[PDB]
């Protein structure tokens, strides 16, 4: 007997066909557009999307006036709206099925640094995210997979302790400035 929990999940599913050209094609294209480390990130996002779609498939089969369908579906639509995938106009459980992987990959903090102009390349966005230069509200996030919410999308800043932010230039400026 111990005071621990062993509950844990695998967040990806490997594809069944190992080397087919179109699958490797699509995954490499998404790696290029959204600047990712390996294929496990694409598999992770595809598995989360499969989770959401499987939930929607279990919810469509119920009757329209089912209380379970109503509550679970409205909560799921609220969740996908707050992430920044669906739209306030199309808040229906039918439209959840019409979702694509890049609609989730557009919400990563890497791409949100890239699009909003905080950086200039998506690999640049990743290298700024890892090195504690980008904050959200008041917390320095170091993870390039942070799914940024809609209310949280508005204010992403320079992380004032950073040299790009408030002050304190780093070790390289400090060393080169004391050369003479």
């Amino acid at each position: 007997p111990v005071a621990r929990s062993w509950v844990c999940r695998k967040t990806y599913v490997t594809p069944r066909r190992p080397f087919e050209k179109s699958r490797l094609d699509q995954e490499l294209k998404l790696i290029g557009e959204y600047g990712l480390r390996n294929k496990r990130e694409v598999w992770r996002v595809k598995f989360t999307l499969a989770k959401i779609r499987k939930a929607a498939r279990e919810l469509l089969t119920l009757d329209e006036k089912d209380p379970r369908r109503l509550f679970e579906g409205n909560a799921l639509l609220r969740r996908l709206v707050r992430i920044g995938v669906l739209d306030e106009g199309k808040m229906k459980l039918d439209y959840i099925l019409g979702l694509k992987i890049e609609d989730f990959l557009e919400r990563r903090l890497q791409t949100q640094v890239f699009k909003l102009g905080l950086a200039k390349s998506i690999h640049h966005a990743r290298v700024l995210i890892r090195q504690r230069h980008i904050r959200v509200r008041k917390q320095v996030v170091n993870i390039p997979s942070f799914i940024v919410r809609l209310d949280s999308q508005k204010h992403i800043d320079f992380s004032l302790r950073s040299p790009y932010g408030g002050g304190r230039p780093g070790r390289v400026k400090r060393k080169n400035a004391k050369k003479g």
């Binding site: 050209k21 179109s22 094609d25 490499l28 294209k29 290029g32 557009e33 390349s121 998506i122």
Partner: protein
């Protein structure tokens, strides 16, 4: 490339064209034809069957 016009290593158009161009260097008894004048995109399963 970058952005959204990323033509990758495993592109079906480029790989098919390369498969036809690789088919052009077969043995002389093999009959190829004029698959370059028209655009061929010859897939790996088809080309692997032919190559075999």
């Amino acid at each position: 490339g970058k952005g959204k016009d990323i033509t990758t290593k495993h592109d079906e158009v480029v790989c098919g064209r390369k498969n036809t161009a690789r088919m052009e260097n077969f043995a002389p008894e093999f009959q190829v034809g004029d698959g370059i004048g028209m655009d061929l995109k010859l897939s790996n399963h088809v080309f692997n069957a032919l190559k075999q």
